[PDB]
Design a protein around this nucleic acid. Structure first.
Ligand SMILES: [Mg+2]
Length: 844
RNA sequence: CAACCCCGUAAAAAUACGGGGUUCUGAAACGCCAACGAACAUCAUGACAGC
């Protein structure tokens, strides 16, 4: 196998640019900035030098550039000017894109790389907006301000929809404290969501890039309050909340003033600045804890205090490098100039070992002050600090309109999805700034078209990148606690049995098990079961995910097919299977060592789960996680019940989550197809009120330019994918392709998955499960036309006979993506679909 | 694991073999951050209580 971590990239080279006949070589800088190193000019080719940089001994040999870095070794790279067309992309849209964004064609390859980073900023945003729209459409079943009341029809639907009580399932989007927001704020949020949704599918075409002159004076007011809400909560009473951590830190560092520690802690914790530095801090800490002198904090005595312990340890590492500017730089360069992946691990081990000896004593001093007695003492004297530090607070700084829109989106997403959106955006913006820096340094054109000029400039992009980092930290924090209500209790009992039964029956069982007095107040005596449900099924992140993306009425079908359950359990490692088996075993099961024996018992336990088993829980008992030998008969029974429920919810959560992941990767393909058709000048026709998505692949199969410098090449020696796409184009249904597009847009695989998951034969990947469900929907609903294509009958017979999807049918309805071969191969071959599960391609 | 370009020995095929490049190919350049991922996550020790 070949890795993109090549010799040239290791030796120091970052980029190789072509400008007006000369070639320019750059090198790595501070963070992501690039500095100029060498220039080879035209004709004479003296191999000119620009700065010391890191490159040395650059020469030209044939069509190759031969250079050398700081280490003694020879690196070889290819001259960018010795190509059939310099800087041209495989999709043949360089000039069109440059004219669309800048207004004139350029003789270089710097601008098109910048344009693709902008093109990548819209795929992930479209994915997440589609997910959010589906979530709101699923949980709640189906002009500016004044006209809506005058309509008398939209007002009668908005007043009732806003009246729905399922809005609690989104944490802070619609509910503050324990009361509903004003109507106009909800209206503003919904209108903004609709506008972004209609923008991201490709309102004016420049809406997102100029919002100051296209937002009314009432939408700006709403976005400001939501940002001011979270900032005032954290900025105020910051000293009172974090008294324990500040007292310990000032004890470890006695020679430092109180003001310095307070400011340093604010940067480490609120606006995290220790993450994007160059080396991992979490990974360094893990290796230090495996040393002989420090392998005690891994024991069970520190289970109750482990989140607080690890925060203190990380701050000590960050503070050590914030004062040693020489050792920090050496570590980054060592990691950036490594040969293989095994070499990186050796560097981390050496650094981790030498740190444990240097600052291991400070680790123990902090760990001797984290216990029950000391923590309570500190909390009493919480008003002994008086520090201003008002300048660096996040509340005393304005924020842009683009960043405020992102925060509003974060109010409707969970922890993992916030990471995916913000991480991708940060990377794209960092790359854009570097390209503008190189262009401005070389005296080339850097001004965008007037429409894009306000947003796409270096002065604004730096501000946006700084704001996006804070939003990631502040929007993932735990929201304030809220009181559970009757609606949530109904859904909790509807998962553990009680599927599709009248609300009166659920209400009667609520009265019998959770007593309510004659005055509408709970009885103080017996409330064990209610606390068990609230603390294990209502306050779990998995339960929220199941309600948003699935239906509690029909969610029990996923654990009735042994093939589906056994596929999920087989992926869990052996160590975690043993712990599940031990706690959840029972009393009449012999102890076994084989893995397959353990899966069989666990599979049966998940299948038979009812709420009546948990009706007698010793909720009043206390479980000791520090010394597991002090637990007794009543305590151990409680552990079994909360372990079973966690396994029950986890299996459903994993199946639902992975089906959404596969679906979103098909939204990207359809989003790109509409974008590319407009640029290439090809319109998508209509026939019998359908959309022929296969028009672009037919048009580009008979184009002279695309068949010479394109993905689909028709020449002697490179005529492989031209034939296959042409052959597969003859085996397609217009109805089948159109039906597939509607399935992906509405995410109907996840929603209608209770009617077709009971008959799957054998599973080996999530790819097979997704396509089995798709091909079952087409067969039952008669979404095909055998008259126009006599081959769709053969595919359906293969599916019904073998109880598994057909490989030749996935190539029929995924053909409108054939003009891009890498995307077509990835989405039609199981081996190449998943990045984390690579397998050899099956030749046949 | 697949794509594209350059360079070598056979050769006119859906060309095979052996080397090197690629932010201008696909969720996809290097070093952080993320994801796979299930024992979690998180400005606030843990548990009970309160809803
Ligand atoms: Mg790219």
């Amino acid at each position: 196998q070949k890795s993109k971590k090549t010799v040239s990239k290791t030796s120091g080279l970052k980029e190789a640019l072509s400008v007006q006949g000369t070639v320019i070589m750059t090198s790595f800088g501070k963070g992501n900035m690039a500095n100029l190193s060498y220039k080879i000019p035209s004709s004479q080719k003296p191999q000119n030098l620009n700065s010391s940089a890191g490159l040395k001994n650059v020469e030209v040999s044939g069509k190759k550039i031969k250079f050398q870095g700081r280490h003694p070794k020879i690196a070889t790279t290819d001259n960018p000017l010795f190509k059939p067309q310099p800087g041209m992309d495989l999709l043949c849209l360089k000039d069109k894109l440059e004219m669309h964004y800048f207004g004139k064609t350029f003789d270089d390859n710097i601008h098109i790389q910048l344009i693709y980073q902008i093109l990548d900023i819209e795929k992930i945003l479209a994915v997440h907006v589609n997910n959010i729209v589906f979530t709101l459409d699923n949980v709640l079943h189906p002009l500016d301000y004044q006209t809506l009341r005058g309509q008398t029809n939209k007002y009668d639907r908005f007043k009732n929809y806003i009246k729905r009580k399922e809005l609690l399932y989104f944490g802070e989007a619609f509910y503050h404290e324990n009361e509903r927001r004003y109507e106009e704020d909800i209206f503003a949020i919904l209108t903004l969501l609709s506008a972004l949704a209609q923008f991201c599918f490709a309102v004016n075409s420049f809406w997102l890039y100029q919002l100051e002159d296209q937002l009314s004076d009432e939408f700006k007011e709403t976005l400001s309050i939501l940002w001011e809400e979270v900032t005032e909560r954290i900025d105020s009473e910051f000293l009172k909340t974090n008294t324990v951590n500040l007292h310990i830190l000032c004890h470890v560092f006695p020679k430092e003033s109180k003001e310095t520690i307070v400011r340093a802690y604010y940067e480490f914790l609120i606006k995290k600045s220790f993450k994007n530095m160059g080396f991992s801090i979490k990974k360094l800490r893990e290796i230090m804890l495996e040393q002989s002198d420090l392998k005690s904090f891994k024991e069970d005595k520190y289970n109750s205090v482990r989140a607080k312990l690890y925060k203190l340890f990380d701050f000590i590492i960050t503070y050590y490098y914030d004062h040693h500017a020489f050792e920090k730089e050496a570590l980054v360069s060592s990691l950036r100039s490594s040969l293989t992946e095994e070499n990186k691990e050796e560097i981390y081990i050496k650094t981790a070992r030498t740190l444990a000896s240097a600052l291991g004593a400070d680790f123990k001093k902090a760990a001797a002050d984290v216990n029950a007695k000391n923590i309570r003492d500190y909390q009493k004297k919480a008003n002994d600090y008086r520090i201003s530090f008002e300048d660096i607070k996040i509340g005393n700084t304005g924020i842009g309109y683009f960043s405020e829109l992102i925060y509003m989106l974060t109010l409707l997403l969970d922890g993992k999805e916030i990471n995916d959106l913000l991480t991708t955006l940060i990377n794209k913006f960092d790359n854009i700034i570097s390209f503008i820096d190189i262009l401005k340094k070389l005296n080339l054109e850097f001004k965008f078209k007037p429409e894009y000029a306000d947003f796409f400039n270096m002065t604004n992009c730096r501000y946006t990148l700084e704001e996006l980092r804070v939003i990631n930290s502040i929007a993932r924090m735990q929201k304030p606690s809220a009181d559970a209500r009757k609606i949530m209790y109904r859904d909790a009992l509807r998962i553990l049995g009680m599927d599709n039964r009248p609300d009166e029956e659920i209400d009667r069982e609520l009265e019998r098990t959770m007593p309510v007095g004659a005055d509408g107040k709970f009885i103080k005596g017996k409330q064990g079961f209610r606390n068990f449900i609230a603390s294990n099924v209502i306050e779990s992140s998995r339960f929220h995910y199941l309600v948003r993306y699935n239906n509690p009425h029909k969610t029990r079908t996923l654990v009735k097919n042994p093939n589906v359950v056994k596929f999920v359990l087989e992926g869990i490692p052996e160590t975690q299977i043993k712990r599940y088996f031990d706690v959840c075993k029972g009393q009449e099961i012999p102890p076994t060592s084989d893995k397959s024996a353990q899966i069989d018992v666990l599979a049966r336990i998940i299948s038979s789960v009812d709420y009546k088993i948990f009706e007698d829980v010793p909720q009043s008992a206390k479980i000791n996680k520090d010394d597991p030998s002090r637990n007794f008969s009543d305590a151990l029974k409680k552990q079994r019940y909360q372990a079973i429920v966690s396994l029950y919810l986890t299996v459903m959560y994993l199946i639902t989550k992975n089906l959404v992941y596969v679906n979103s990767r098909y939204v990207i393909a359809f989003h790109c197809l509409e974008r590319d058709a407009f640029l290439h000048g090809v319109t998508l026709p209509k026939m019998n009120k359908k959309i022929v998505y296969s028009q672009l692949t037919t048009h580009l199969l008979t184009d002279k330019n695309y068949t010479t410098y394109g993905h689909l090449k028709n020449q002697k020696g490179h005529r492989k994918w031209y034939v296959l796409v042409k052959n597969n184009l003859q085996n397609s249904d217009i109805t089948a392709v159109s039906s597939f597009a509607n399935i992906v847009a509405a995410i109907s695989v996840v929603r209608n998955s209770n009617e077709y998951i009971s008959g799957i034969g054998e599973l080996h990947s999530y790819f097979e499960l997704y396509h089995y469900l798709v091909q079952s929907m087409i067969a039952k609903n008669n979404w095909y036309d055998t008259s126009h294509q006599p081959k769709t009958a053969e595919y359906l017979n293969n599916l019904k006979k073998h109880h598994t999807y057909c490989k030749d049918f996935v190539k029929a309805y995924c053909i409108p993506f054939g003009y891009v071969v890498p995307r077509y191969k990835n989405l039609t071959i199981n081996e190449l679909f998943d990045r984390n599960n690579p397998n050899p391609e099956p030749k046949e």
